[PDB]
């Protein structure tokens, strides 16, 4: 009927994410700024979450 758990919610063990991408990542919670090229404000309504940028290199073939 009711167990009345008294623990902080934590589902890191059920999501299947490697600990490298849990203990090290740094999300960023923000409302995106308006694109200065335009005057429309319809892209500044909802909050967004994104992760920190990691390395990108040039693949030897095709660049």
């Amino acid at each position: 009927q009711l167990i009345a758990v008294d623990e902080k919610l934590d589902i890191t063990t059920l999501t299947g994410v490697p600990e490298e991408h849990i203990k090290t990542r740094k999300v960023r919670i923000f409302v995106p700024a308006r694109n200065n090229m335009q005057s429309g404000v319809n892209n500044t309504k909802k909050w967004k979450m994104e992760f920190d940028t990691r390395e990108r290199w040039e693949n030897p073939l095709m660049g």
């Binding site: 009927q1 009711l2 167990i3 758990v5 934590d10 063990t13 059920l14 090290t24 990691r54 390395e55």
Partner: protein, 115 residues
């Protein structure tokens, strides 16, 4: 209160009881898995790997999360027992073809920009 409903276990003790049952089942199954799959690891290697996977998430203090983990463990045990899993699936627990990533600061600084 919190208006939460359990999956299987009311408290931590039942969850623990189920964890021990799952551990016994896996401990029993390891030798048969080694024979059937024709693995090149010893039974001690399989059993201490099972122990390490059990201890990997020994910090959980929520009975519902523990029940879900036990359910997933039983699913994997059932896949192992019925031979649905192949040799590659069993050996994926050992990461035999991955270079050991360093954990100290100096080697991480030497290799790249990723902390």
């Amino acid at each position: 209160g919190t208006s939460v409903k359990p999956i299987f276990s009311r408290d931590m003790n039942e969850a623990k009881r189920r964890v021990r049952e799952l551990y016994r089942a896996w401990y029993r199954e390891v030798p048969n898995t080694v024979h059937l799959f024709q693995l090149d690891i010893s039974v001690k290697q399989g059993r201490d790997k099972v122990r390490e996977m059990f201890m990997k998430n020994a910090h959980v203090t929520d009975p519902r999360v523990v029940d879900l983990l036990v359910i997933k463990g039983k699913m994997e045990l059932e896949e192992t027992i019925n031979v649905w899993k192949q040799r590659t699936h069993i050996m994926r627990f050992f990461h035999e073809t991955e270079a050991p990533r360093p954990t100290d600061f100096l080697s991480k600084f030497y290799v790249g920009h990723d902390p």
